Amino acid sequence: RYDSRTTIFSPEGRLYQVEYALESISHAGTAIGIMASDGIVLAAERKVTSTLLEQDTSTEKLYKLNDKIAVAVAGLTADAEILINTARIHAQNYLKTYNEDIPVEILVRRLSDIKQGYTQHGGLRPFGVSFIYAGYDDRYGYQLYTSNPSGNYTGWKAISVGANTSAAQTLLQMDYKDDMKVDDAIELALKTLSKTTDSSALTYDRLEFATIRKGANDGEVYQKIFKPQEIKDILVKTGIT
The 10 Å CB-count burial string (b at 16+, else e) for 218-232 is: eeebebebbebeebe
CB of 4 to other proteins, least distance (A): 11
Residue from the set 103, 128, 135, 149 that interacts with other proteins by CB under 8 A: 103
- Binding-site member from 1, 52, 98, 219 for other proteins (CB under 8 A): 98
Of the ranges 86-94, 144-152, 155-163, 177-185, which one interacts with other proteins (CB under 8 A)? 86-94
If one asks whether residue 165 binds other proteins (CB under 8 A), the answer comes out as no
**Using the rule CB under 8 A, is 97 a contact of other proteins?**
yes
By CB under 8 A, name the one of 48, 50, 78, 99 that touches other proteins. Answer: 99
**Of 98 and 198, which CB lies nearer to other proteins in the complex structure?**
98
Judged by CB under 8 A, the chain residues 105 through 134 that form the site for other proteins are 106
Nearer to other proteins, 103 or 128 (CB): 103
Give the DSSP H or E segment for 67.
Answer: none
Note the maximum CA span of the chain.
Answer: 57
**DSSP per-residue letters across 64-112:** EEETTEEEEEEE-HHHHHHHHHHHHHHHHHHHHHHSSPPPHHHHHHHHH
Give the Cβ contact number of residue 18 at 10 Å: 19
- The site string for other proteins over 210-239 (x = CB under 8 A, - otherwise) reads ------------------------------
92 interacts with other proteins by CB under 8 A: yes
Q: Does 135 bind other proteins (CB under 8 A)?
A: no
Q: What is the DSSP annotation of 183-225?
A: HHHHHHHHHHHHHHSS-SS--GGGEEEEEEESSSS-SS-EEEE
Q: How far is the CB of 132 from other proteins (least distance, A)?
A: 18
Nearest-CA neighbor of 212 among 31, 29, 36?
A: 36
Distance in Å, CB of 210 to other proteins, minimum: 13
Nearest 5°: CA angle at 125, between 120 and 130? 95
Q: Tell me how far apart the alpha carbons of residues 45 and 204 are, in angstroms, rounded to a whole number.
A: 10
Residue 66 or residue 196: which is nearer to other proteins going by CB?
Answer: 66
Q: What is the distance between the alpha carbons of residues 195 and 192, in angstroms, rounded to a whole number? A: 6
1 binds other proteins (CB under 8 A): no
Q: Which of residues 35-74 bind other proteins (CB under 8 A)?
A: 63-66
C-alpha of 124 from chain center: 24
CA distance 123 to 129: 18
Residues that bind other proteins (CB under 8 A): 63-66, 88-89, 92, 95-100, 103, 106, 138-139
